[PDB]
Structure 1
């Protein structure tokens, strides 16, 4: 048996990080060419996410076909071995998961015009291999990368972030322990703007905190967005070098 705190007077957290550090970010494009039109493998901390974009293609049922826009579908597979303690049941039908899937759809319905691929279907399959806090933000980044890899038109990037709050000051990018310890805010940010695609608060949060917490998240998300551009451009430079 043990006990632990949140934020020490020395400005140190349970894992050793300070109040404003992003975890290790690794990004990966075109990971499954023979399985999808677009694919991305995300590593944000201990989080490991495979994202597959299949489409635009013919619908399997003509009943479900829109002549004005493409049909966008997202299925999140949170594996039974994503956490330390293996879950006995499947999480697929869980109301918490249905809300997550619904949330993500609502977010990107306004971010892709989805008016230039009529009579087609875009299927997005996601596999969460490992989970360690901020899984929603990582899900957002995985879809954005995979969609771009598929050459599917969109207006801008959508970057996802996780916020942790203790006392006066929130902690950027929370892990499971911190998530357990304190309420968190998940932010969907469009491009380099201040506009949120997704605002998600599931636990109690003082009303004074949010304005400042939002400010920290937006600044951090911009850094994340910059990294993503670097991640793809860098890969392109590396790929070109490999070709040479």
Structure 2
């Protein structure tokens, strides 16, 4: 009662609708690359350093950079103030964002270095890991790191037995499945795929396809955020 109806959703959107997504690239002075993303009520900042001198010097891979990802929510990002620090959730989300960004990066280009990706969720309303990946990509492109593709991400989910796109916190919390997908769109390569909840095969595949149509949209926004940047530089 009643995340769908009729046939609109709680915020009034249709079931294949995305929340208002804003994205800005290059928002931070210190980071080598940064992006900010407002995706619905999410407000998430991604920074990249560098490729940089890796320490400790034993972590280094001799033939390639390593990707390190840290995803973190500010204490004020959630309804119930999250104590500062790492938790199992953020650690798994970090592992799973890394495994999403990695394939897009030509890591052998910078042996013995780390590419450090930070995702800060300043406000969260479901879909942070995919909003985060979507910003990490931009922040990576922003860092001038060559990539095979942007990684775009978006979740699909089930609410009221119905497959919807792009869950909000209500829908994720009270829904039947959360299906985040990150793809590199050009080659249709899924670099993140998670399913939390309970679906049949057909419901899972349809949610995976829906989230990919969602991530393809996000991608256009992503390119359009790079375009916008690669137009600001067009000065003078």
Same fold (TM over 0.5): yes
Match of 1:181 in 2: 174
Equivalence for 2:74:
79
CA contact (8 A) 2:105 2:146 kept: yes
Aligned length: 235
Please report the TM-score for the alignment, with normalisation by the length of structure 1: 0.89
Aligned counterpart for 1:51 among listed residues 30, 36, 46:
46
1:222 to 216, 226, 229: 216
Where structure 1 has 5 or more consecutive residues not aligned to the other structure, the ranges are none
Q: Look up the match of 2:31.
A: 36
Separation of aligned partners in 1, 2:136 and 2:146: 13
Note the aligned Cα RMSD (angstroms). Answer: 1.8
Quote how far apart the aligned CAs of 1:214 are.
2.4
Report the Cα distance in structure 1 between the residues aligned to 2:200 and 2:44, rounded to whole angstroms.
32
Unaligned runs of 5+ in 2: none
Inter-partner Cα distance in structure 1 for 2:53 and 2:200: 48
Partner of 1:21, secondary structure, is coil
Q: Distance in 1 between matches of 2:28 and 2:181?
A: 28
CA distance in 2, matches of 1:61, 1:168: 50
Query: 1:110 deviation in Å?
Result: 2.2
| Alpha-carbon distance change, 125 to 220 in structure 1, aligned in 2, over 3 angstroms | closer
Matched, 1:110 2:103: yes
Structure 1 residue 91 displacement after superposition: 4.4
Any idea what SS the aligned residue of 1:28 has? Answer: strand
Deviation at 1:107, TM superposition (A): 2.3
1:62 equivalent in structure 2: 57
- C-alpha separation in 1, matches of 2:202 and 2:74: 37
State which structure, 1 or 2, has the greater radius of gyration over its C-alpha atoms: 1
Query: What's the CA shift string for 1:96-152, capped at 9, x where partnerless?
Result: 222111112222232213111012222112221100111111111011000001111
